[PDB]
Structure 1
Amino acid sequence: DVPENNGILISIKEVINAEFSRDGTIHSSELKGVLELRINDHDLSHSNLKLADSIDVRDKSFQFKTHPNIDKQSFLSTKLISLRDKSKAFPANDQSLGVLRWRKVAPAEDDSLIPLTLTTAVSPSESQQGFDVIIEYESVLETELADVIFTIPVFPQEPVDINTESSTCSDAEVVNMDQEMGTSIKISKIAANDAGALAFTIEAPYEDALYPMTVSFQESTRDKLAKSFTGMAIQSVVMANDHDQELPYDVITSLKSDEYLVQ
C-alpha cells in the first residue's frame, strides 16, 4: 500500500527491536516511534493535532523530540502539535511530515517494550538427525498478529516436521527455505493476549547451528480510537485559529518488529 488520504491522515509508526537469551530472559529492547502527518487539502493546512490526554509528554524515557518547525512548548505543556510560527501552515501536498519522534530503551530483564515474548528449548531427536525444537510465545497485544514468521538459520535436506497437535496453529507451515537465510515457518494467527507453542523437528549438526532464531511480525489498524503499543494516540484534530472547531481525519496506528531475535 501507499494508503489512501481523504484530507488529513495521521500515521503512528512504531518499530520494536528485542533480543532474548535462548531460555527467554530479555537481554535488550528498543522501541522507535514516529507520528507523521499527511495533508492533501489546502482547507486543512491550518490544523493542529492534539494528543491523547493519557500520555506523559514530559516522561524522559520516551526521549520525545518534536520536529523543529513544531512548537516544543505547547507540546510539552498542552500535548498539542502546532506550528512554531502561528501565521504559517503545513504543506498541503500530501507529503509525510514528521512531527514527533520517540525512543524508549529497556535494560536486561525488563519486558515493558516486548509485545511478544519468546522462549526456546532444544533436545536431540529420535526421528531426525537433529533437534526437537519448541518455541513458546506469549502476546500482550490487544489485537491479533497475522502471518508471524519464525526463521531458523539452517537449510536442511530432510523436510522440517512440524509437530502438529503439539503446536497451537495447526496450519503452521514452512514457507521459505534458503541457503543464505535458513528456513522460515509461518504461523497464521497469534491472537490477542494468548500463549502458544510452535514445535518442530529439524536436521542440524549441533544446537548452536539453530541460532539466532528470528521472528517477524507486523500489525496495523485504521481505527480512530487506536492507541499504539506504547500508548500514543490522537484525541482530536482542530483548527489553528479556533481550537473548538474539530476537523475530519483518519489515523493509522502500526507496529513492526525489526531485529527481534533469540540468541
Structure 2
Amino acid sequence: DVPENNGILISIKEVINAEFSRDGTIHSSELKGVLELRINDHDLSHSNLKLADSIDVRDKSFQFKTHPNIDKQSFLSTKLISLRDKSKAFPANDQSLGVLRWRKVAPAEDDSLIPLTLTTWVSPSESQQGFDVIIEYESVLETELADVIFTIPVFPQEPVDINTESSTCSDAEVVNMDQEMGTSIKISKIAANDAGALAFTIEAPYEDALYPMTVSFQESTRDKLAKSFTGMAIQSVVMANDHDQELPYDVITSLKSDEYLVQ
C-alpha cells in the first residue's frame, strides 16, 4: 500500500476528529497534520522546500512544530523548510521523514475543520422492534469521497432494512454485524460539495442505544497543485544553494477521519 516515488515525494497527511450532537451542532473538532518527505536519489538530497506563500506560518492556532534539525528561523521568516546545518543533506534512502507537524483545535460551533457535516433524525418504526433512522450528511470537499462507512453500535437479530427510496446512494449495503463493533453500513460515493442522506430501519432497545454513531472516510490526490483541507501546500522544491534552481517532485495530499462521530 506504499505509493511510488520517482525521486522526491512529498506527503501531506491530515487527520480529522469531530463530535456532533444528534441535532447536528458541532461540539468539538481537532485536526492533526504532518508533512513527510521521501527522497530516493542523491542528486536531490541537497534541497529545500518552499511552502505556498498562501500559508501563514505564524498562525498560533496551527501550533506548527518543525523537526529539531530543521531551521526554525528560515521556516518562520521565509516559509522555507531546510536543515540548520547547511553542509548536510536529507536522507536519500526513500524513507519518510516528518519535517513539520501541526495541530488545530476548534471549539464548539466552529465548523472550519469540518469536511463532512452530520445530523440524525430518529423515530420509532412500524416494521421492526426499533427505529427508523436518517443520517443527513453534506460534504464541502472539492473531491468526492468513496466507500464511506457509518457504524451504529448495536447488534440486531432481524437484519437491517435499508430504505432505498428515502436514501441518496440507493445501493448502500451493510458490510458488518459483529457484536464487538456493531452494525456498519457502506456508501459508494459522496459527491463533492453535495448533500445526501442515508435512511434505514434497525432493531434496538431504546434511542440512546444507537449512539454514538461513527463515520469513517478517507481521501487522497496526487495532483502537484493539490492543497490540503487546511490550505497546506508546496510552492516549489529547490536546490539548497541556487534558490532559483527548481527541482522535480510529486505530492500526495491525504485526509483520513479518526474519531468522527455523532453522540
| TM-score, normalised via structure 2 length | 0.99
Alpha-carbon separation, structure 2, partners of 1:32 and 1:252: 16
Post-superposition offset of 1:165:
1.3
Alpha-carbon separation, structure 1, partners of 2:206 and 2:213: 14
Alpha-carbon separation, structure 2, partners of 1:232 and 1:40: 24
Deviations 1:98-127 (A, max 9, x none): 110000000011111010000011100001
Query: 4+ residue runs of structure 1 moved beyond 3 angstroms?
Result: none
- The alignment of Structure 1 onto Structure 2 pairs a total of residues equal to 263
Alpha-carbon separation, structure 2, partners of 1:32 and 1:90: 24
Alpha-carbon separation, structure 1, partners of 2:36 and 2:185: 33
Alpha-carbon separation, structure 1, partners of 2:34 and 2:129: 46
Post-superposition offset of 1:83:
0.7
Alpha-carbon separation, structure 2, partners of 1:5 and 1:59: 31
1:220 alignment partner, SS class = strand
List gaps (5 residues or longer) in structure 1.
Answer: none
2:54 alignment partner, SS class = coil
Post-superposition offset of 1:177:
1.1
Alpha-carbon separation, structure 2, partners of 1:152 and 1:20: 15
Post-superposition offset of 1:157:
1.1
2:45 alignment partner, SS class = coil
Post-superposition offset of 1:155:
1.2
Deviations 1:114-163 (A, max 9, x none): 10000011100001100000100000101000000000011111111111
1:86 alignment partner, SS class = coil
| 1:164-203 matches, cutoff 5 A | 164-203=164-203
Alpha-carbon separation, structure 1, partners of 2:187 and 2:134: 14
Deviations 1:186-205 (A, max 9, x none): 00000110001101000011
Alpha-carbon separation, structure 2, partners of 1:214 and 1:46: 44
1:75 alignment partner, SS class = helix
Deviations 1:39-87 (A, max 9, x none): 0001111010100110011001000011111011111111110111111
Task: Specify the alignment match of 1:156 in structure 2.
Answer: 156
List gaps (5 residues or longer) in structure 2.
Answer: none
Alpha-carbon separation, structure 2, partners of 1:257 and 1:84: 34
Post-superposition offset of 1:183:
0.5
Alpha-carbon separation, structure 2, partners of 1:143 and 1:112: 17
2:42 alignment partner, SS class = coil
Task: Specify the alignment match of 1:23 in structure 2.
Answer: 23
Alpha-carbon separation, structure 2, partners of 1:125 and 1:30: 35
Q: CA RMSD in A?
A: 0.6
